[PDB]
């Protein structure tokens, strides 16, 4: 293969990228999304407050231009994200009981209809855990409804859209433990009880030379609970600059996530949390950390390019 799409496509596999829409008049953006990747998921623009910024008044603006870019392009369409605690607009923050329920059921309900048959899969949880185990404290929808709001979530999304694939996404779920163990018992109950649930996505924000050892075992574990399980936000960040060890070792770290995924029959790919460094979310949250994607500033190739390329 000479991209990684191609070496993604042999392996019968998902190679994505978060998309941000603005960037797709610059030249060297859109030349490398065209030709790397097999699948493209919205950064931002399928988020709650990018589609319902005021209740009940919609903007499909952003998202439309994302499922356009994926149909052009031929590429699969991954939905981020239905419900999530942060990027929540104040209206719904101060909305109660019952009242909340039917914003987030309808927000839901909306969503998932206008994008049916776009979408082939969507992220309808995210970040429901914490770490160390047990359900997010600081999330409005556990707080306002309880522990029952997931499962609500995903047998809306899924009377919405009756094929898309519905999944539950998570971060610090990598490797065997605490939060990892919770997401295991929900999925285990769910699929007990016939709760509509199809994927398990593994965020990957991961720090160099700290991968999980026991990634592929964890992702094992999901897949026999008969679930699909995708790698959904991977970047591998470090204390900037870089320099040769620093980026030698993102190498190998990025052909173990991926060979990890190679690993795990149900495990349908893995998608980059952006093309390159230059507009990567990491030093905005972590200040003096970063290079973490595959492509330099410059839009060059870094080692973990070809690292990719072997995973594959
Ligand atoms: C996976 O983690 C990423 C990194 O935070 C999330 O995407 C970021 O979300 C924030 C808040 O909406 C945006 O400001 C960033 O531009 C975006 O990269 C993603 O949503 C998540 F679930």
Redesign the pocket.
Known sequence: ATTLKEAADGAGRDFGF?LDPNRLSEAQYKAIADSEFNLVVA??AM?WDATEPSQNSFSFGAGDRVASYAADTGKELYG??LV?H??LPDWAKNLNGSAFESAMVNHVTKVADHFEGKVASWDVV??AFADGGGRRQDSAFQQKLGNGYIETAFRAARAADPTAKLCI?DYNVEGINAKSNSLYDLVKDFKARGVPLDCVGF?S?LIVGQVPGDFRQNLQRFADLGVDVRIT?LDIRMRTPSDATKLATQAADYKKVVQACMQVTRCQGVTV?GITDKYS?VPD?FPGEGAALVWDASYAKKPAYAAVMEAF
């Open positions: 978060a950064e931002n988020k981020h994200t999530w942060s990027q995210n970040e996404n965020q924000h936000e949390w979310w949250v």
